[PDB]
Design a protein around this ligand. Structure first.
Ligand SMILES: N[C@@H](CCC(=O)N[C@@H](CS)C(=O)NCC(=O)O)C(=O)O
Ligand SMILES: N[C@@H](CCC(=O)N[C@@H](CS)C(=O)NCC(=O)O)C(=O)O
Ligand SMILES: [Mg+2]
Lengths: 214, 210
């Protein structure tokens, strides 16, 4: 038995969705209302009270990148996610960590803030895009020739690019064509296609929030 | 060849020192002046420009918990650090992540700030202590019956406890005896004994800065 507590537009939740589908395991997806969190969510992640929460045979695993590695280590022979080489594996972990650290606050402020905080966030996220663009280089994936951990770690953000462009006056699509091509590559995988919500859906939800709350 | 670029009182660098010694590998330690970073440091960690940086056969590995896992995966049979069970491994990673996330800002502010910011930091770090104390519970180690990843992730902070008590007016030693006993346990390992600097030395270094 596998349960995933998640939020549809969560790029972190999307990672675990993708990892589960890469392994072709069946699981129960449960949508959480983050303004009205379930007893199960609070019981299973008392420390952070965040989604995604992966519940396997009744036991909780928290933090999306830790969940992906957990899923990979349980089913290593089906669509291996992490490299087998320790050095390459260390590098994949580094770049997933980089994404987590650099996007957590700015990407929240991109859609939830205006004024000075949003401005700061724009600068930081553009810096992330430039850095990831440089790291990707001319490879098909962050993982080189094949879809890997860092691809999983960032692809969910693609579903937000249009939102960031519209609500934060960013230019992403025309400025980072290698990243757009990479995203198009990843989207051909059924795991990714299933996990990522429609970009217009995200945009509509975020603009609604900004109208009503701001 | 293994080079470690580090700063002696860095609790993060201490993790990698410990992991290397757990595996009994020889390596070159290089002390970095963090106010005057070496060209090697800037070349090898251009993204964060932080220590510890582990350089193996000329190739850099950054972030201490990632370095520890790298070292564990290179030499898995000598004093294994991470659990072999995937779920237990996930939990070890979770608690090392918890420590990284909750200590990064407060522990810097404990000695570098005053007023409202230091007060906030004290509140946050005591919460970390209480949470880890609860997680440790009655086990000998965070890793259970044996020294493991989370023990490595936190043990370096012990060498700063006296500093926090003195410069932030915190009470740690008298308030968290299970954590004190745990640290005594860890200190019996040669890796930990080598890595952790004297508590008064750390305090002196911070007092100069303040
Ligand atoms: N580091 C976490 C971040 C997860 C996260 O931020 N989840 C958000 C949804 S996108 C959340 O649950 N927020 C709930 C809250 O903070 O109240 C991970 O990688 O899983
Ligand atoms: N997340 C990093 C943190 C390492 C870190 O913060 N290192 C400090 C020394 S304790 C540093 O290099 N500071 C550089 C500076 O102050 O510019 C890790 O775990 O290795
Ligand atoms: Mg062990």
């Amino acid at each position: 038995e596998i349960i995933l507590l998640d939020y549809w537009a969560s790029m972190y939740g999307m990672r675990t969705r993708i990892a589960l589908e890469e392994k072709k395991v069946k699981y129960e997806y449960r949508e959480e209302d983050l303004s009205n969190k379930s007893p199960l969510l609070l019981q299973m992640n008392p420390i952070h009270k965040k989604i995604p929460v992966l519940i396997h045979e009744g036991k909780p695993i928290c933090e999306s990148i830790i969940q992906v590695q957990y899923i990979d280590e349980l089913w290593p022979d089906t669509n291996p996610i992490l490299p087998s080489d320790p050095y390459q594996r260390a590098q994949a972990r580094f770049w997933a960590d980089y994404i987590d650290k650099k996007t957590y606050v700015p990407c929240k402020a991109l859609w939830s803030e205006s004024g000075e905080k949003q401005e700061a966030a724009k600068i930081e996220f553009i810096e992330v895009l430039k850095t990831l663009d440089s790291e990707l280089g001319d490879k098909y994936y962050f993982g080189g020739n094949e879809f890997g951990l860092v691809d999983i770690a960032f692809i969910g953000f693609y579903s937000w690019f249009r939102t960031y462009e519209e609500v934060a006056n960013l230019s992403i699509v025309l400025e980072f064509p290698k990243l757009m091509a990479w995203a198009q590559r990843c989207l051909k995988r059924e795991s990714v296609a299933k996990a990522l919500p429609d970009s217009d859906k995200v945009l509509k939800s975020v603009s609604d929030h900004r109208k009503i709350i701001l």
